[PDB]
Amino acid sequence: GPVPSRARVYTDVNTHRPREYWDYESHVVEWGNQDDYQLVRKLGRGKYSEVFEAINITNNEKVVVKILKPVKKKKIKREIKILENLRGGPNIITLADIVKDRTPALVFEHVNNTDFKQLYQTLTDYDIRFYMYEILKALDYCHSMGIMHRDVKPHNVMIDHEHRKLRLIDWGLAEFYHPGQEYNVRVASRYFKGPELLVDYQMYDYSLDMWSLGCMLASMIFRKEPFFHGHDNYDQLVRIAKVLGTEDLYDYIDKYNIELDPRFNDILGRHSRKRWERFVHSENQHLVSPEALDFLDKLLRYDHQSRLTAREAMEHPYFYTVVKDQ
Numbered sequence: 001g002p003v004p005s006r007a008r009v010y011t012d013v014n015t016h017r018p019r020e021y022w023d024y025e026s027h028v029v030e031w032g033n034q035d036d037y038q039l040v041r042k043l044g045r046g047k048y049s050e051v052f053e054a055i056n057i058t059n060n061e062k063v064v065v066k067i068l069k070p071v072k073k074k075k076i077k078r079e080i081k082i083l084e085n086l087r088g089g090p091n092i093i094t095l096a097d098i099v100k101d102r103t104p105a106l107v108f109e110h111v112n113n114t115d116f117k118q119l120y121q122t123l124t125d126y127d128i129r130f131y132m133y134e135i136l137k138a139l140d141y142c143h144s145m146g147i148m149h150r151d152v153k154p155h156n157v158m159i160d161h162e163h164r165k166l167r168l169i170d171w172g173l174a175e176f177y178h179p180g181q182e183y184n185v186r187v188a189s190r191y192f193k194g195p196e197l198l199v200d201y202q203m204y205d206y207s208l209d210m211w212s213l214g215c216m217l218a219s220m221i222f223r224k225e226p227f228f229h230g231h232d233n234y235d236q237l238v239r240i241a242k243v244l245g246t247e248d249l250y251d252y253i254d255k256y257n258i259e260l261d262p263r264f265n266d267i268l269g270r271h272s273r274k275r276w277e278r279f280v281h282s283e284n285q286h287l288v289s290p291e292a293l294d295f296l297d298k299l300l301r302y303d304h305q306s307r308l309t310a311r312e313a314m315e316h317p318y319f320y321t322v323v324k325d326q
């Protein structure tokens with residue numbers, strides 16, 4: 001069987017908490033009053049919800065309402081408990097209310113989000129460093145609180161650019177970290193899935209989020225969205241291997257005694273590790289620095305144990321100007 005793994009940091013944060021902190025199956029949902037909100041317009045669909053802008057008629061606040069499609073009680077309880085545990089944490093979306101009427105609806109703080117397809121193409125070198133640092137504050141916080149996001153991606157990072165305001169949203173896939181637990185690998189968007197998910201290594205941890213973050217950083221500095229563009233989950237690992245190289249991949253598989261799907265055998269092939277420089281062009285060079293590439297290299301690792309922690313990432317030279325300015 002596969003060799004076990006433990007998070008390097010925040011390993012036992014939940015084991016030290018009272019049971020109720022992480023035992024979300026026992027959680028009793030506190031329902032607010034549905035009549036306090038009126039929907040204004042549809043914002044879009046998720047996997048298991050439709051999202052609206054609304055008004056709290058009680059206080060004239062703009063809010064966001066996520067009306068749940070049918071999902072198991074325990075999955076709703078998990079997201080609620082996590083949002084409550086993290087509330088007040090840096091750049092974590094605030095869950096403001098939970099209502100019903102027999103469908104449950106989560107009510108969030110509204111972020112005046114700048115279009116992800118527009119905003120990203122205006123960002124300067126400084127902006128990317130600044131917003132990356134803001135995401136790292138949210139990830140260090142949630143990790144320190146015993147929670148993996150497991151769905152870090154551009155769509156789940158709301159930025160009100162005028163106010164330099166960022167929030168990490170959509171904690172619907174997040175889970176509590178418990179050492180030894182075998183997690184579901186069927187999480188995250190294709191392009192952002194960590195190698196652990198793609199090879200079916202279940203004993204993963206907070207470090208998953210750091211891979212996803214590295215994918216975001218690469219797509220921003222190189223202006224290549226998505227960065228790792230797979231055709232499916234199998235081809236996704238191939239796309240990663242054509243950049244990181246196959247030697248390190250097979251080293252990771254050996255170290256954890258992972259059983260690789262036989263399918264993969266015929267498709268991974270043999271690939272050198274590429275230098276980052278092949279992704280730099282006249283369009284993106286203003287975003288790309290030695291610091292950026294050093295930081296990126298230390299997030300995008302097969303071996304989850306070798307990736308930077310959120311807290312370590314915050315100390316990287318890439319952020320020195322940002323840290324001084326704050």
Ligand SMILES: CC(=O)Nc1ccc2ccn(-c3cc(NC4CC4)n4ncc(C#N)c4n3)c2c1
Pocket residue numbers: 043044045046051064066093108109110111112113158169170171172
């Ligand atoms: C709520 C959730 O987890 N899922 C989700 C899924 C789809 C959409 C589509 C739009 N949203 C938004 C749009 C904006 N702001 C307005 C300017 C566009 N915000 N501001 C704050 C949240 C939250 N939470 C939000 N959500 C979604 C959220």
